[PDB]
Amino acid sequence: TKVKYPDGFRSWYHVKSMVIQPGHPLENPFGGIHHVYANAEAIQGLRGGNYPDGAVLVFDLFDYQEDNHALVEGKRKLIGVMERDAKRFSATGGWGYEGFGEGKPDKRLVTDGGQGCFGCHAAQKESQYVFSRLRD
Amino acid sequence: ATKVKYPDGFRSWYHVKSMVIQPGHPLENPFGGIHHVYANAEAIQGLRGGNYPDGAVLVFDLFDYQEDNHALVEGKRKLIGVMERDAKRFSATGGWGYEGFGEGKPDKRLVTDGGQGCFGCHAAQKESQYVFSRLRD
Ligand code: HEC
Ligand code: HEC
Ligand SMILES: [Zn+2]
């Protein structure tokens, strides 16, 4: 029913990164530099298999500071989490969605059972609701 | 110096940090783009405040980016820079060997001077064993 905090996510495989700057549609509240991490089970789905139960993707979001035309990572704003479990999270397409303010376990952000996150991710139905693609 | 080994499988290693260097910045040429730093297990012992065992490898992975409606999106890989720790083998440049691979390709080795040019800049970080990156949370 609740998404588990993903302890140890920082040592998982770095899928990709992206910078969202002011003015982008997703600025609020996804503005900043973000990195996507996948555990072993999520890698299987990214590589083209089905996502097994227990797959986890993390969206790791940092503020940045612009300093002499370099963007430098500042403080972590939040993490977004998707946890695969076809049965428990069937209401939201088999993924449970949670946000943790500042990446801390006790700061849960989602208040609508994940429906809001799910409504945008539904656009990626064809890729099992995941936007990120593996690059080399 | 012997050759620095191409770091096979580095994409699976621990992601240390990232930074974006944009036009105007002093390092735009040649380090412009979005870069990511990776470290293998031995390098982590060194980054943690331990000492660096021989066999520690750090990788700087550099991508061009594109601007897309107030997002910077990663484009093509321009190169990877590699530091491979071997105190005796690479003593001429501080115990680390330095190599670049154009577009990340094993056959596109870039360094022609034994790593002296790369070392000239990293020597500023003598105090941290020639490594600029710091571990974060
Ligand atoms: C559209 C309006 C979105 C909403 C609302 C949410 N997310 Fe999403 N998310 C979106 C995009 C475009 C992306 C891809 C970013 C990229 O670098 O390409 C993401 C990514 C994630 C991920 C990473 C896995 C993936 O699908 O690519 C996670 C773990 C994730 N998002 C979680 C998440 C949660 C918990 C949300 C509600 C609190 C949520 N997202 C909303 C677009 C949108
Ligand atoms: C100054 C003019 C530099 C020269 C020349 C080279 N590098 Fe360097 N390097 C420099 C900086 C400021 C940084 C830090 C980037 C960051 O995000 O903080 C780096 C980093 C690396 C790394 C990563 C490990 C570390 O020291 O932080 C590697 C593996 C690396 N650089 C390799 C490398 C090689 C192979 C070079 C010559 C081909 C080289 N660097 C030159 C600054 C400068
Ligand atoms: Zn605009």
Author numbering:
A (entry chain B): 3 to 138
B (entry chain A): 2 to 138
Can I see the authors' text?
The first laser-initiated data collections used a delay time (1.44 s) much longer than the predicted NO release (microseconds; Section 2.1) and binding times [<1 ms;], for simple verification of NO release from our cage and successful binding to form a stable end-state complex. To establish suitable parameters for effective release of the photocage without the use of excessive laser power that could cause sample heating or multi-photon excitation effects, we conducted a laser power titration using the same fixed time delay of 1.44 s between laser and X-rays. Three SSX datasets were collected at different laser powers under otherwise identical conditions, at 9.5, 0.95 and 0.19 µJ (approximately 5, 0.5, 0.1 nJ µm−2), to resolutions of 2.00, 1.80 and 1.75 Å, respectively. These datasets yield similar protein structures, with full NO occupancy displayed in all of them, as shown in Fig. 5(c)–5(f). The binding of NO in the different structures exhibits a similar Fe—N bond length, and some variation in the Fe—N—O bond angle, but the direction in which the bent NO is oriented is not correlated with laser power. Instead, this is relatively poorly determined due to the difficulty of fitting the small diatomic ligand into the electron density. In McCP-β, we were able to show that the photocage successfully generated the initial distal six-coordinate species that is an end state in this protein but a transient intermediate in other cytochromes c′.
A widely applicable approach is the use of photocaged substrates, where the photocage is soaked into the crystal in advance and then activated using a laser pulse to provide uniform initiation of the reaction throughout the crystal. Laser parameters for photoactivation are systematically explored, and time-resolved structures over timescales ranging from 100 µs to 1.4 s using synchrotron and XFEL beamlines are described. We have demonstrated a sample and time efficient approach using fixed targets to carry out time-resolved SSX and SFX experiments with an NO photocage over the microsecond to second time regimes.
